Amino acid sequence: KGSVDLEKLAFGLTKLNEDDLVGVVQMVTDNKTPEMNVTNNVEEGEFIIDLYSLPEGLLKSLWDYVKKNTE
Amino acid sequence: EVKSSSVEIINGSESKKKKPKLTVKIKLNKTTVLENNDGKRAEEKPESKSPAKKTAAK
């Protein structure tokens, strides 16, 4: 994978434990761009975030993270 | 030498492929059944987005 499989990214970050998925939600909100479609519902405690609109910089940083966190 | 009147532009066309985007709902670990830790309590009912109906238009 030279590029990021957006499917393995999505399904890879939501399968994680607290420390891992929290690290995910913090990276996406820290560098929140006008493209990425985030919706933090604090009631259910969830980040409904569209990774498809993440820049290459973010979806690579997140991929590297969640892939070494799962594999 | 002279380069001359070379290189014509190419007139292309659009392609509307927006596609259903792959969104994900990352579930954060809120106050559930877990080990000995105290959670949170609501401050008050603020009603910050309180709507209003009309003022002067008879």
UniProtKB/Swiss-Prot annotation, chain A:
Protein name: Transcription initiation factor TFIID subunit 14
Recorded family membership: Belongs to the TAF14 family.
Entire protein: shown range: 174 to 244 of 244
Superkingdom of this protein's organism: Eukaryota
Domain notes: The YEATS domain specifically recognizes and binds acylated histones (acetylated and crotonylated). Binds crotonylated lysine through a non-canonical pi-pi-pi stacking mechanism.
Other noteworthy facts: TAF14 is the only non-essential TAF. Present with 3100 molecules/cell in log phase SD medium.
Location of the protein in the cell: Nucleus
Subunit structure: The 1.2 MDa TFIID complex is composed of TATA binding protein (TBP) and the 14 TBP-associated factors. One copy of each TAF1, TAF2, TAF3, TAF7, TAF8, TAF11, TAF13, two copies of each TAF4, TAF5, TAF6, TAF9, TAF10, TAF12, and three copies of TAF14. TFIIF is composed of three different subunits: TFG1/RAP74, TFG2/RAP30 and TAF14. Component of the SWI/SNF global transcription activator complex.
Cross-link entry Glycyl lysine isopeptide (Lys-Gly) (interchain with G-Cter in ubiquitin), positions: K8
Gene: TAF14
Function: Functions as a component of the DNA-binding general transcription factor complex TFIID, the RNA polymerase II associated general transcription factor complex TFIIF, and the chromatin-remodeling complex SWI/SNF. Binding of TFIID to a promoter (with or without TATA element) is the initial step in preinitiation complex (PIC) formation.
Coiled-coil portions: none
UniProtKB/Swiss-Prot annotation, chain B:
Biased composition (Basic and acidic residues): 37-50
Subcellular location per the Swiss-Prot or TrEMBL entry: Nucleus
Biased composition (Basic residues): 16-28
Chain's role: Catalytic component of the chromatin structure-remodeling complex (RSC), which is involved in transcription regulation and nucleosome positioning. RSC is responsible for the transfer of a histone octamer from a nucleosome core particle to naked DNA. The reaction requires ATP and involves an activated RSC-nucleosome intermediate. Remodeling reaction also involves DNA translocation, DNA twist and conformational change.
Note: Present with 1990 molecules/cell in log phase SD medium.
Assigned protein family: Belongs to the SNF2/RAD54 helicase family.
Subunit structure as annotated in this protein's UniProt entry: Interacts directly with SFH1, CSE4, histones H3, H4 and H2B, and via its N-terminus, with RSC8. Interacts with LDB7, NPL6 and RTT102. Component of the two forms of the RSC complex composed of at least either RSC1 or RSC2, and ARP7, ARP9, LDB7, NPL6, RSC3, RSC30, RSC4, RSC58, RSC6, RSC8, RSC9, SFH1, STH1, HTL1 and probably RTT102. The complexes interact with histone and histone variant components of centromeric chromatin.
Protein name (database record): Nuclear protein STH1/NPS1
Lineage: Eukaryota, Fungi, Dikarya, Ascomycota, Saccharomycotina
